[PDB]
Design a protein around this nucleic acid. Structure first.
Lengths: 177, 140, 255, 207
RNA sequence: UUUUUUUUUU
RNA sequence: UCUUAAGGUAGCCAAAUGCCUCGUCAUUUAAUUGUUGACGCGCAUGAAUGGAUUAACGAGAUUCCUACUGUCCCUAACUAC
RNA sequence: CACACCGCCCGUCGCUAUCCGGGACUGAACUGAUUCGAGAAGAGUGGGGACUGUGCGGAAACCAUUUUUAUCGCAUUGGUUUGAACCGGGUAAAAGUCGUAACAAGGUAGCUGUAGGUGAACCUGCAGCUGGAUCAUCG
RNA sequence: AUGUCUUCAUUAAUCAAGAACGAAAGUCAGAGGUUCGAAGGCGAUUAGAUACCGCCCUAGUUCUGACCGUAAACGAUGCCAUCU
RNA sequence: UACCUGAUUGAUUCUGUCAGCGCGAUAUGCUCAAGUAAAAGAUUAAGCCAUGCAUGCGAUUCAUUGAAAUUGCGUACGGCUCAUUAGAGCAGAUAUCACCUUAUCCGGGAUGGAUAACUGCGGAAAUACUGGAGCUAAUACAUGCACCCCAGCGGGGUGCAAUUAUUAGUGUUGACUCUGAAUAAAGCAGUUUACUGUCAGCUGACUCUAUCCGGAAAGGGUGUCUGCCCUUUCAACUAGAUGGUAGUUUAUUGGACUACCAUGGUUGUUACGGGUAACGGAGAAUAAGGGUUCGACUCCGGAGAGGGAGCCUUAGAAACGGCUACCACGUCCAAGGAAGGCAGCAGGCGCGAAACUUAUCCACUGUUGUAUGAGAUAGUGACUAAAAAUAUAGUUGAAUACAAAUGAUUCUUCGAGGAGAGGGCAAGUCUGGUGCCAGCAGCCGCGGUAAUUCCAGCUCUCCUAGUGUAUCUCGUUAUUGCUGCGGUUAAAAAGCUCGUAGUUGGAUCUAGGUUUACCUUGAAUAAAUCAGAGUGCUCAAUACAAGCGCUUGCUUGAAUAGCAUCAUGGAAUAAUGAAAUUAAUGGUUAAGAGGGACAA
């Protein structure tokens, strides 16, 4: 009959639930990049830790290992295409230097207000929620959506939004009526 | 010292198995009478009926009378004492009442200054005792 | 169970068919005959996945009832027929001819061919014996038994079998210096030149084979099929010419 | 019903074994044929795979074989004489493989004379009957007598066999299983085995 | 030579 | 506190030894002044006037279960003298 | 001992609660195996021959027997649970009675083994140990 | 232990099960019974004193032949080999 | 992320546990804007079941296209559950020269009489009950249409298969009593198309049905080697028990069974017995490394259909949506009789802490294909995995989808809750009551009339549509220690010695200028899961897709790694063997190991 659906976790809780240093640092990160909850940042931390642990497991092997070559090139490729890893920094011995801020900057929510599409990060989030942003002719309503290097330059206002060209909003229609 | 020869695997394994029985946790989990001795029969929750209510002198240096109720489990008919959390909740427990009971937290050990009491009431008359204390509901 | 089985679950189906995990609870079971369950393919799977000729299996059965498909030149209407290795499939209405072949990965690929190609096929000699009346026969690994064959034909040798004439044309030998296919093992879909033969008396013997790229690997006899003499292949091979690319080489080829 | 299962026994070490399942069809047994001497009686039994066996209940004729002469003639089983397994079988006249019985000699004598144009220790004072003459003294061309002359070249017969043929009841051993093949085809005893079993039989009847 | 005790918490 | 030579110790018990008494509790039964097991301020138990046990043994005393039966319900018939 | 000797602390006895053990009662209940007795039903074999096809054949009921053997009875035995007069152990409980056993040379140094005795802690005999209150005492 | 230019040539270390020995007290049987001395009985001391102290003592303490197999049977430290 | 923190004291350092702390499983509290995938009466009661369904579809058509019936085929697959079960079962390798097979592949192999529906007569309360009478059909029933012997003139036999006995060796396998060629009998019952629609031109070609032999393939029965839980308050066990011969039975081997015979067989390298809240595996949770625990459950193997037992049919069953009997428990009776098996789907009662609609369909996925509670759709569903609103949803009608639908994907009308706030541990000595009471508190501890801990009121912290509580697993735990603990005083060296099993054992053989064990590399090794490339399903869990031209098209990806057996190479390390006509004829040394002798 039906099978087991394949699931997987992305968030790993810290071993110490409370410590002023981590609490304050993570609060500061939430402030810098508009996020919803600490799970958001733990997700990025655990993706980063998966990346770093895989890179370390690879570096434990010597340089020209077939697996090392394939995985390291692929991982550097993925980070490059996302726009986190530097394209002049091609090595895992150097990928072992990254932070959550790097991946968090590559969220749509940041780019919206970064490139002048919104005043505040909160305004950017509510605009995306109300469907006033678009990417490569693709209305993405997911703030954590991950913006690649290529798509970095392919975001403008929605082709249907009142602010991107369309019918006036509900308030404007009320006033006109 | 322990044996170290390259052909002593049988001795090492047999000795380890023999000495595991001197461990409280392993013996407690593999004795075989756990189900017969444990009132809940290995479960986490159980249901029962009230018989009477008692006040237990809290241990020294604490001075108070903790208000518990003697209950009879429906699964096996065993008699236990269950604690009624929160203030003025014994009022909501009347003799001959159906109660849901759970562990107190220390896995069959008494908790705090209440002597010999290792269970606690989680529902009375199909109502949550916390709801009864908080006024979210009333006695059926 | 109390008797034979008729079904075959999707997961238990051989992996080489590449059947999507979320694509139903059963897999079309090949019926007994020329080939074996783990070393064949259903015509229904052919028409549904490889050629996209059928959106659904009802459509596959509809196409198959029309008696338009030929296998070995014999019109089949069994969607569960065991179309396996070195099997000729000729859809006359569309005038399309295919021969079953093992991809480097080991999968079966749509190997388009012409009429001259479709007109023949190869068979390995599974045994040679003497049926009643004193007429010697040979049995091939695909079950085909051929009467009155050339006496020099022996075990593990290849014979060209003519579909149109149902006769043995040529007899290629299993000896050092013959292009040999590799059907099973982890070297399924690998073509290489036979070399030395480690002879185990009471167990399957071992063969050494080196491909055109020079890579060498060994295997058991039962996985070794001769497909020619010297270096020439008696049939056309798919794009790849029986060479295993390592993963880095495959990526390099991709970009 | 009757089962041939390996379980239900004790293990090599003497331990009791678990019963793996309820009795299975493919491991059944059937009651013994226990064939006897009398009018031909054979039953068909349907067996595994749709095949079928011939269970003999009573048999009188044996299609017996003479090995040296390479001949095979249908004689009649006369009496049971010796059985290695158990003597109740010989007492009850059970025809079981390897059982030792008595057969007629007339068919083999008829074949011997019809094939060798010579007497088979025939009686020393009794003239051959008309049927015997119809095959002994017959007259045909010399081209036909030549083959008989050639067949005469190798025609000596052993003393023990001659004595059995004199008594008219030959000793034979059943080589078939009447409960399995339904037939009592056996072979005539001759030589070392014949002497051994004759000595056994004589020892028992002395006992 | 004889020489036993000191209510509970803080 | 009176008092003796010493004040019944270890054991055991309503006993073949306890009046009150058909002692009180339990067991056996439908029902028991009976049996057995407990209790013991024991009218008046008790240590070679031997105390407490004890396998085997007994034409010794006692209670019960089973089998069996004219002991009985409830008598009848037959044989010898 | 640290509330610092007006310290700490040990037992019997008495009350309360609770867990466990022994216990006459051939106690009781549930459950599994094994011997024996009976034994349904099928299958094999030997009889039988209603009926109908041509002295021959096929044959149903039924009878006897062999085998597989459910199931039921006693009987033995294993395992789990359990009542019981009474007789005992352990533990817990703010403020019960009797004493002073131990911690100072604890007022008879303490403790181990063994044996006896005494309301109780305990006392005494023999041989050990220092974890002693002596690392020592002059040849 | 020491001495050995004697002999064998790995025969060794530790050891479940198994076995010998094993203080004192204690048990059985037979001899002995001086001293001391559990229990016991007295005189003291004491609030009491079933103790410490004193007096008279029974088992025992001694020997022979059997049992028991335990001690703070302690160096509270298993045995064998090697280095500092 | 290879991690710790509070608590014994007047204070200190330890031992040691308790408590805290992270993940996961199950249950449950409060709360929950909409959507996507998605587990789901296993745990206890393999308990009991009302009611509906879950297995039905070429030859034979005088009923009105095809009903009914007879045949044929299938119902041994599929589905469910985990009770039993500890040389059972399973995993890997491996035999079956000891065996059995329908469906599907390759080779060879226009004969007569009776019976239903149909007509009618009927019985019973009651069945999916049936007897007579009149027909009447067949792929039903029947019937089948060159060597040997005598005589080289002539007569017979020889198909396959098969019983026994015998002959020579046209092929293999490592090896064959294997397969072929023959010889002599005899029964043997099995087989070598009286089939449907037909078409083309006396000549042809189909589709179909039936049917044996040989070989395959697929499936199964058995055999071998290695591994797989706890227990000595189980140490000895076993009597068809171990083996031999002759038989019987089976498809075949076999003490499988029988007769006779012998005394064998297992065991401290753990036999035998007992327990398991025990189906085995693939795997799951946790997780530096080494591991610890679990695994009823979607795949593979096994078993069962209330408990037993016995059978019919068949290629295949000891079948249970087949029968027969017994036991337990029910159902309808007009009391004469007749019945039942949801551990299939959906539902009901019970049991419980614990688990969903008495729904729609073959539209999708397979079964031989109209039929399929297999399978696919929708319902309840904070099991769970991913993605996300409360600031700077809904609604009306359209368009889409679907077997029909709903809900998703486009337009248009209007239009915050859980825990917490003394320490562990992030976060208040604010206000009133009570005076060790009520209460809190996992632990340490607060509350005794001036409470940061309760009861309130006011305030803040963690997480967040989730967050607590209870039981259990793993980590924490070097508190089970192989890596890797400890034993003078904290728990722990036997009173001491001898001693079998077990464990461990001194140095020494080509340095230079035959067996094993062990290591390396390959062979055989179902998927799904774990690790692992690529790809904007909007991301991600996921999934395995997809991506360009232009219409009649090209290219695709759907990878790569993950005990025992066999072989190759290596010859250190550790065991093991050789010797008590010529040649060097053949014994290592004698341990700052051990034993024995001698001395005094």
């Amino acid at each position: 009959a039906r099978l087991k659906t394949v699931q997987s976790k992305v968030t790993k809780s810290p071993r110490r639930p409370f410590e002023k240093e981590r609490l304050d640092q993570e609060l500061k990160l939430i402030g810098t990049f508009g996020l919803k909850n600490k799970r958001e940042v733990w997700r990025v931390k655990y993706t980063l830790a998966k990346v770093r642990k895989a890179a370390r497991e690879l570096l434990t092997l010597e340089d020209k290992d077939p697996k090392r070559l394939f995985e390291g090139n692929a991982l550097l490729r993925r980070l490059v295409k996302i726009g986190v890893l530097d394209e002049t920094k091609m090595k895992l011995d150097y990928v072992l230097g990254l932070k959550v801020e790097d991946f968090l900057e590559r969220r749509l929510q940041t780019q919206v207000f970064k490139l002048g599409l919104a005043k505040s990060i909160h305004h950017a989030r509510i605009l995306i929620k109300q469907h006033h942003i678009r990417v490569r002719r693709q209305v993405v309503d997911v703030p954590s959506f991950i913006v690649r290097l290529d798509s970095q330059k392919h975001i403008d206002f929605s082709l249907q939004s009142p602010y991107g060209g369309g019918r006036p909003g509900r308030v404007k229609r009320r006033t006109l009526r | 010292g322990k044996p170290k020869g390259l052909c002593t695997a049988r001795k090492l394994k047999t000795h380890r198995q023999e000495q595991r029985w001197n461990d409280k946790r392993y013996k407690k989990a593999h004795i075989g009478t756990r189900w017969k001795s444990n009132p809940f029969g290995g479960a986490s929750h159980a249901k029962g009926i009230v018989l009477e209510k008692i006040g237990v002198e809290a241990k020294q240096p604490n001075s108070a009378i903790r208000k518990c109720v003697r209950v009879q489990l429906i699964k096996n008919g065993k008699k236990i004492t269950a604690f009624v959390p929160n203030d003025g909740c014994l009022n909501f427990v009347e003799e001959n009442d159906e109660v849901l009971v759970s562990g107190f937290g220390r896995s069959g050990h008494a908790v705090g200054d209440i002597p010999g009491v290792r269970f606690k009431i989680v529902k009375v008359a199909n109502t949550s005792l916390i709801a009864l204390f908080k006024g979210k509901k009333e006695r059926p | 169970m109390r008797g034979p089985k008729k079904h075959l679950k999707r997961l238990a189906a051989p992996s080489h068919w590449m059947l999507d995990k979320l694509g139903g609870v059963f897999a079309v079971r090949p019926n007994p005959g020329p080939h074996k369950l783990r070393e064949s393919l259903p015509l229904s799977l052919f028409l549904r996945n490889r050629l996209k000729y059928a959106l659904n299996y009802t459509e596959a059965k509809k196409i198959l009832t029309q008696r338009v498909v030929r296998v070995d030149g014999k019109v089949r209407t069994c969607h569960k027929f065991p179309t396996g290795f070195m099997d000729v499939v000729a859809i006359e209405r569309t005038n399309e001819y295919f021969r079953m072949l093992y991809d480097t990965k080991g999968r079966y690929v749509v190997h388009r061919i012409q009429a001259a190609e479709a007109d023949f096929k190869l068979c390995k000699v599974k045994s040679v014996r003497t049926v009643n009346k004193g007429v010697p026969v040979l049995t091939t690994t695909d079950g085909r038994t051929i009467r009155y064959p050339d006496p020099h034909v022996k075990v593990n040798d290849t014979i060209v079998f003519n579909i149109s004439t149902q006769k043995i044309t040529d007899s290629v030998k299993f000896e050092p210096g013959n292009l040999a296919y590799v059907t099973g093992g982890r070297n399924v879909g690998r073509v290489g030149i036979i070399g030395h033969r480690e002879r185990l008396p009471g167990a399957s013997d071992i063969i050494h084979i080196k491909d055109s790229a020079g890579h060498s690997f060994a295997t058991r006899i039962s996985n070794v099929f001769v497909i020619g003499k010297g270096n020439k292949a008696l049939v056309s091979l798919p794009t790849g010419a029986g060479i295993r690319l390592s993963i880095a080489e495959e990526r390099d080829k991709r970009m | 019903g009757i089962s041939r299962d390996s379980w239900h026994k004790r293990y090599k070490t003497g331990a009791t074994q678990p019963v793996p399942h309820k009795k299975r069809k493919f491991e059944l047994g059937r009651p013994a044929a226990n064939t006897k001497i009398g009018a031909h009686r054979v039953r068909l039994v349907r067996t595994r795979g749709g095949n079928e066996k011939y269970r003999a209940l009573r048999l009188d004729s044996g299609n017996f074989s003479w090995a040296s002469e390479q001949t095979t003639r249908k004689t009649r089983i006369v009496d049971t004489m010796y059985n290695a397994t158990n003597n109740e079988l010989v007492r009850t006249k059970t025809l079981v493989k390897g059982a030792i019985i008595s057969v007629d000699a007339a068919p083999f004598r008829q074949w011997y004379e019809a094939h060798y144009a010579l007497p088979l220790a025939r009686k020393k004072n009794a003239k051959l009957s008309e049927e015997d003459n119809a095959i002994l003294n017959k007259k045909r061309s010399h081209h036909t007598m030549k083959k008989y002359t050639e067949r005469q070249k190798t025609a000596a017969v052993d003393a023990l066999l001659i004595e059995q043929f004199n008594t008219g009841r030959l000793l034979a051993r059943i080589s078939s299983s009447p409960g399995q093949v339904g037939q009592a085809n056996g072979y005539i005893l001759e030589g070392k085995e014949l002497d051994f079993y004759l000595r056994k039989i004589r020892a028992k009847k002395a006992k």
